[PDB]
Design a protein around this nucleic acid. Structure first.
Lengths: 39, 638, 67
RNA sequence: AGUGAUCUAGAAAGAGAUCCACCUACUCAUGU
């Protein structure tokens, strides 16, 4: 039914939000590291 | 910046017909309820006969004392037109045994038994008589539209019932869902009553893209479905214009195999003549396609609609009580609205309704009903304190607003001196409650005598109680702006309102000199009748009409003496910047900004669009802020 | 070897922890059994990422190939 | 109806705080 579509859309939006967060959190983590060492 | 460009320039160089309505066939049931119960919910279907019939019902079943019956409508047009019709139905003179009442439009007299008024006007009556003693039954109609004035009347009348056994109260809705309303009025009964049966399509997957999906749905319906007009719903003018140009062009194209298709708009700004074009026939080999806002949800009909779209979005006011700020946000509709939309296909035959979302999202993801959780409460807290309600935070509200927005509203009213610190009505707050305005407008007006310009400030508060006056069509913005300049005042668009009203009252014109000076005649008329009504309240309450000989700085000081809170400094390295909240705004692209004494504005309206804008602005000397509200201009609180 | 390069004598004390487990004459590393190698590898991985967090104040690897 | 007027030029050793212009940039009111 529509519960599968709602759950899959919410899981896709949560996965893309976690991917954007984990892109903000490797390279950019160490960029924040270098900025905190400069502070 | 202006100065630097000048420096570089210098440096360089019939009776039986009404029987037939469905509510007749349950009139017996409708006594037995009315008779047995002090409060009653009735719920219909729009067309079933409730606005007309049920008040008449009540006036045979409940008759002679020195008393009236009110019916209450959220909509001026429904009050007026349904009172005209019900006067004919009785066979009585309009303004006599049946009458209106609307803001600055009363049509009742000492004969009126049956009184069909705006919700806002019954609420003002209840400021002057907190028992509504002059009514023996009060019927709050279209309660599903959950306006501010109906929700405050519902609250009030809850309490008034437990002071007056001889008051009976009838809440009338077009949304079958009464449970919420029964519960809120102490488990009160329900009585549940010509719409044809709408088919309802849903998308299998959430759309992300609802404009282009709505366009393609309307062309699909026009190819494949039999005769019947289409009603799209879309959220604002810019969107609606765009979809009218692109469904007009795509329909011309498919005219190489398909019938003729006439588009129209509809939205809140439209001139009257283009509004009237919505009602045209549906060419001849052919169909029509209204592209409306939510105005076509409830507030009219268009007679031949058989197919509704429904991208389930509208453009709704939202108010944050812990930023302090209203905005105007494209937002998912309520389930009640989605139902109304559907029921516009159904007036004239079976119908279909093509909902650009999932059945799961209708059932489970739209909020039931939409206004008290979407409002600045300042007006509401003035009205409650006039109603004697000393514990605002405890007031019995079927959905209580956030106690922060109530607290912010007392603090505004204290800085407007409507209340004292101890939350008690000053002589201003009394008199302000006598005017049907917001508190900032009312305060401005009141004080205007003591700025020697109460005629001028009466006229500007009348103007600011109506729309924008100035027509600017998307073809002829140069001609419209040329027109507008011949009333403009350089850094004083409030003074521009005074000038165009005075010119409309000039010994030189009416309708066709409105159209040839690109003015809304309907606005200017409405502002003239609200100027007449507000001058009658001024006389009634002893506020002397005053003018001077010609004094713009007096006009400025009066306006500041209401709108003090709504001030916005020029930034001196950046944009414009606001006294309350410390927002970073721009002057609205309607108005140039003479940056040489501009250095403070007073603004009418904050407008949220993708940027922050501030709209209808007039210059102020900041020294005249500090003298006219020293308690709000305390560095100390800053 | 990343554990020896990061913090040398800590990983040497982790190698030279149990005095029973010795090194044969032609071997380099102590002759552990397999669960003993799991314990050694777990302590070395914890040592690497412990001094990596204590050097670069980073929270955790948000991705497996990043780790 | 016009021609014609053409320096330089590299080897050894030693030295020497550099201090300065080649990419443009801004328009929504859902209602009453």
């Amino acid at each position: 039914k529509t519960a599968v579509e709602s759950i899959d859309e919410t899981l896709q939006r949560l996965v893309r939000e976690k991917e954007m967060e984990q892109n903000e959190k490797g390279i950019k983590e160490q960029a924040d590291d270098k900025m905190d060492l400069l502070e | 910046p202006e100065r630097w460009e000048i420096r570089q320039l210098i440096a360089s160089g019939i009776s039986a017909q009404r029987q037939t309505l469905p509510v007749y066939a349950m009139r017996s049931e409708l006594i037995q309820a009315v008779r047995d119960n002090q409060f009653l919910v009735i719920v219909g279907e729009t067309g079933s006969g409730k606005t007309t019939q049920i008040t008449q019902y009540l006036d045979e079943e409940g008759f002679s004392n020195y008393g009236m019956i009110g019916c209450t409508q959220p909509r001026r047009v429904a009050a007026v037109s349904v009172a005209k019709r019900v006067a004919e139905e009785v066979g009585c003179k309009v303004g006599h045994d049946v009458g209106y009442t609307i803001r600055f439009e009363d049509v009742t007299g000492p004969d009126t038994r049956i009184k069909y008024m705006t919700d806002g006007m019954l609420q003002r009556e209840a400021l002057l008589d907190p028992e509504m003693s002059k009514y023996s039954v009060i019927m709050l109609d279209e309660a599903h539209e959950r306006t501010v004035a109906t929700d405050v009347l519902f609250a009030l009348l809850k309490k008034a019932a437990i002071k007056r056994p001889e008051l009976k109260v009838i809440v009338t809705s077009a949304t079958l869902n009464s449970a919420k309303f029964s519960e809120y009025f102490l488990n009160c009964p329900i009585i549940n009553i010509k719409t044809f049966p709408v088919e309802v399509l849903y998308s299998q997957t959430p759309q992300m893209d609802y404009i282009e999906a709505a366009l393609d749905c309307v062309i699909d319906i026009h190819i494949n479905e039999g005769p019947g007009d289409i009603l799209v719903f879309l959220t604002g003018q810019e969107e609606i214009d765009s979809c009218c140009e692109i469904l007009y062009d795509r329909v011309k194209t498919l005219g190489d195999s398909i019938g003729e298709l006439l588009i129209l708009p509809v939205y809140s700004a439209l001139p009257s003549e283009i509004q009237s074009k919505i009602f045209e026939p549906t060419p001849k080999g052919s169909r029509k396609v209204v592209f409306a806002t939510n105005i076509a949800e409830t507030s009219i009909t268009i007679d031949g609609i058989y197919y509704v779209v429904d991208p389930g979005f509208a453009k709704i006011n939202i108010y944050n009580a812990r930023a302090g700020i209203e905005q105007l946000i494209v937002s998912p509709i309520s389930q009640a609205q989605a139902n109304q939309r559907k029921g516009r296909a159904g007036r004239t035959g079976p119908g279909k309704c093509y909902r650009l979302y999932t059945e799961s999202a209708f059932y489970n993801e739209m909020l039931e009903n939409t206004e008290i959780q979407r409002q600045n409460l300042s007006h509401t807290i003035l009205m409650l304190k006039a109603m004697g309600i000393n514990d605002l935070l405890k007031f019995d509200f079927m959905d209580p607003p956030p106690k922060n927005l109530m607290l912010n509203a007392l603090t505004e009213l204290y800085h407007l001196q409507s209340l004292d610190d101890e939350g008690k009505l000053t002589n201003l707050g009394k008199e302000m409650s006598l005017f049907p305005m917001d508190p900032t407008l009312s305060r401005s007006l009141l004080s205007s005598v003591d700025n020697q310009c109460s005629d001028e400030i009466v006229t500007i508060i009348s103007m600011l109680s109506v729309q924008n006056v100035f027509y600017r069509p998307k073809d002829r913005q140069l001609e419209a702006d040329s027109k507008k300049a011949k009333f403009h005042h350089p850094y004083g668009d409030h003074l521009t309102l005074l000038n165009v009203y005075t010119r409309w009252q000039q010994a030189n014109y009416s309708e066709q000199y409105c159209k040839t000076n690109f003015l809304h005649f309907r606005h200017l008329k409405r502002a003239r009748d609200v100027k007449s009504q507000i001058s009658m309240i001024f006389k009634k309450i002893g506020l002397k009409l005053i003018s001077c000989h010609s004094d713009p700085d007096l006009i400025r000081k009066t306006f500041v003496s209401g709108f003090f809170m709504n001030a916005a400094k020029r930034d001196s390295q950046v944009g414009y910047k606001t006294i309350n909240g410390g927002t970073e705004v721009g002057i609205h692209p309607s108005s140039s900004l003479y940056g040489k004494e501009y250095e403070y504005v007073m603004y009418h309206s904050i407008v949220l669009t993708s940027r922050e804008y501030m709209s209808q602005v007039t210059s102020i000397e900041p020294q005249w802020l500090l003298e006219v509200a020293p308690h709000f201009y305390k560095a100390g609180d800053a | 070897l990343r554990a020896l390069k990061t913090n040398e004598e800590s990983a040497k004390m982790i190698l030279l922890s149990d005095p029973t487990i010795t090194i044969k004459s032609y071997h380099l590393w102590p002759s552990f059994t397999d669960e003993q190698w799991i314990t050694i590898e777990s302590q070395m991985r914890d040592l690497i990422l412990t001094e990596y967090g204590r050097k670069y104040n980073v929270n955790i690897s948000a991705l497996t190939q990043t780790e």
